[PDB]
Chains A and B, each alone.
Chain A
Amino acid sequence: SAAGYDRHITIFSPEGRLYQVEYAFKATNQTNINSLAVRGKDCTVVISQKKVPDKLLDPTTVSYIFCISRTIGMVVNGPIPDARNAALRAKAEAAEFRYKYGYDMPCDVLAKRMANLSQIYTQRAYMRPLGVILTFVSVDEELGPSIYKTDPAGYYVGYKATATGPKQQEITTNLENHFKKSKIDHINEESWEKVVEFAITHMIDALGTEFSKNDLEVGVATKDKFFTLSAENIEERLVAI
């Protein structure tokens, strides 16, 4: 661990590392849930795991998927307070971009903006990074289906598909094997329902033990709108193969 300083603020250790950033990274696995993001031909699908062990909770109020703009959706890995803080700031960023430049904010530009803010947090002494990982999904009017991920260190990158959580390695390996088999960097289907079913199947075979309709959360981005599915829609998708 940090010897002297580096236990409070973000300055270099003798090894050239930033311990507070790494600890913020470790803070992202507190919720112990997983999320997956895949691209279709004209849609992008994000599927997140719901865990509600408490019987006194209202399940409809538990969600880690947020709507940022008309076309952009976001999934957060980490504690829900920093998740909501990040969601509000992302909404403000997208709206201000639209006001200032006359056209809708693309997913990758928003990811870069959030990453620059994270860089601010990693360099300033009196600011702490947010212990969350952000994944933005959309169907950009130029780049087509898009998935971009940002982390507490300020690093962001785009993905053909991605997975994040305590069990991200298994899902990543399964996706890599599937893409080796199919030799296509996306899913060849004409409707987002088939893509959602494929993502559910991938999640089931990776995590194991399956789930019901109340243990899952699905968001789908098309060229016009990003929308979150309800419990009945997820039940229909589970029933339909």
Chain B
Amino acid sequence: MTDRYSFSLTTFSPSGKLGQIDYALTAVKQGVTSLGIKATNGVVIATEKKSSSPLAMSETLSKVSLLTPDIGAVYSGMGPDYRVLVDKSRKVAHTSYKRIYGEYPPTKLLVSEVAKIMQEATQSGGVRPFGVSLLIAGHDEFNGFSLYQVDPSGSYFPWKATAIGKGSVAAKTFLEKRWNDELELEDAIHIALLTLKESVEGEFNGDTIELAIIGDENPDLLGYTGIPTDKGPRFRKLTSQEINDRLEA
């Protein structure tokens, strides 16, 4: 039968390039700017909130998502693909790792699972590639802090600091001139705020930008007491009031 198959939606152009992946990269480059900075004591992940209308409640939709208590992610590109991939990553963290080893996966392995899912969409007969780019920040016992970027083709690379989106080149240069091996988490937060200040055309306040950190364990966020060995989450999303206070300072 002629319905027992469907031809590949992604094929090589004569120059040797996969056109759908390149167009997905273009769609990413048309998105809002997001960035990540890796320090000695933590990782900062930041992005610019956007709204169709002022009447929208920007707190309902969050571009920053906790994958595990020690791993978070941010984006540039198309939102629904983000939502789908985040749900899948949260499920895979449990099905593949926590139900097997009793512990959450390291950052690199979760990044690898997400990247495999994204790659399988570029060799298919009925789904287009995901038109989105990913920044994943995390911490683990045997690797410390880590920051990764994942592309629509499924390639991922580790970065000391990087940015994606519409203002990515200027932000990359600004981070290149403002990074060193002895930076601290607060310095990284300040640098991230300064970098985002150069990309937001409208109001640069606490209700239009979104930040999260991978820092030290927060036992006050566990929800229970009594077990000294139970570490609190290291992922923490800064509130709007904290962002406003840091901007004033």
Contact = CB atoms under 8 A, between A and B. Distances in A.
Interface in A107-127: 108, 112, 115-116, 118-119, 122-126
Q: How large is the interface on B (under 10, 10 to 19, 20 to 34, 35 or more residues)?
A: 20 to 34
Given A11-B128, A153-B80, A158-B56, 11 more contacts: A16-B23, A16-B29, A16-B30, A17-B27, A116-B87, A122-B80, A123-B81, A123-B128, A154-B79, A157-B60, A159-B53
A191 interface: no
Given A14-B23, A157-B52, A115 B83 contact: yes
B55 A16 contact: no
A58 interface: no
Contacts of B130: 123
Contacts of B52: 157
Contacts of B53: 159, 162, 172, 176
The 9 closest A-B pairs by CB, nearest first: A154-B80, A16-B27, A12-B23, A16-B26, A158-B60, A119-B80, A158-B57, A11-B128, A125-B126
B84 A119 contact: yes
A226 to B, nearest CB: 20
A10 B126 CA distance: 10
Interface in B1-57: 6, 9, 20, 23-30, 52-57
Contacts of A175: 55
Contacts of A115: 80, 83
B109 interface: no
24 contacts: A11-B20, A12-B129, A14-B23, A14-B26, A15-B23, A16-B28, A16-B29, A16-B30, A116-B80, A116-B84, A116-B87, A125-B6, A125-B9, A126-B6, A154-B80, A156-B61, A157-B60, A159-B57, A160-B57, A161-B55, A162-B55, A175-B55, A176-B54, A179-B55
B127 interface: yes
Contact of B24 (A10, A16, A126): A16
Contact of A12 (B29, B54, B126, B128): B128
B55 A159 contact: yes
A160 B55 contact: yes
Contacts of A123: 81, 127-128, 130
A124 B83 contact: no
A80 B28 CA distance: 34
Contact of B27 (A12, A116, A159): A12
Interface string A1-18: 000000000111111110
Interface of B: 6, 9, 20, 23-30, 52-57, 60-61, 78-81, 83-84, 87, 126-131
Contacts of A157: 52, 56-57, 60-61
A120 to B, nearest CB: 9
Interface in A144-169: 148, 153-162
Nearest to A123: B127
Contacts of A158: 56-57, 60-61
A8 to B, nearest CB: 12
A212 to B, nearest CB: 28
Contacts of B80: 115-116, 118-119, 122, 153-155
